[PDB]
Symmetry: C2
Subunit: 123 residues, 2 copies
Amino acid sequence: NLPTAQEVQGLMARFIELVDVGDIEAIVQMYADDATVEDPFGQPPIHGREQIAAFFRQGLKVRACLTGPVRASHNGCGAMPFRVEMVWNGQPCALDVIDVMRFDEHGRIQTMQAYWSEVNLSV
Amino acid sequence: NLPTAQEVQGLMARFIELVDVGDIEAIVQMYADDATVEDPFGQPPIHGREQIAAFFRQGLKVRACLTGPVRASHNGCGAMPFRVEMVWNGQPCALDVIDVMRFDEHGRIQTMQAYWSEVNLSV
């Protein structure tokens, strides 16, 4: 069923947990088969689980954690603030991000928009 | 001109500052004359500065502060996490929110979506 506000909080937190551990298959499974991802927002969207899987495999030594509670709505959507820590050619980096997600009637991520730019990056 | 990522950070932070001090006129001036506001997201949108002014006058003993940096994009958009403190019939309340904004070619807020629900509220 369309996720309730409480369920959205759990689903989005789960997403962060999956990125943190780096389970690509589990992350991809959270998305609708034809979901769209805009990360960073403003960039062209990628479509489908294949493109989304390639995207995450490409990006995933990484750590991710919520930096504040997940804000959830009553229409299957939510937004959350988090921090990603990674390594770029042996160099430690950090990025502040906010993901906005819209879930479908099956509890899967239909669309995701990740807000961030170089002003939120530390290399 | 369309706000750069850095300008978006400043504009959105200014918005929070204006809510914190409670300057309704200044807040309203930040919006495009025909801007739309969905607060909380999922609720019907209000349109125009008159409706937006009535909305803020209605809501504004209030304090607001960013709880993390403003995430800004390169296409005039951004998202920010913040906390609002207010009083409901002499009772102190708090609310965690994330505002997503799209600015126009004149640096004004074209659309704003505020994510939050009762799960983010403390009365």
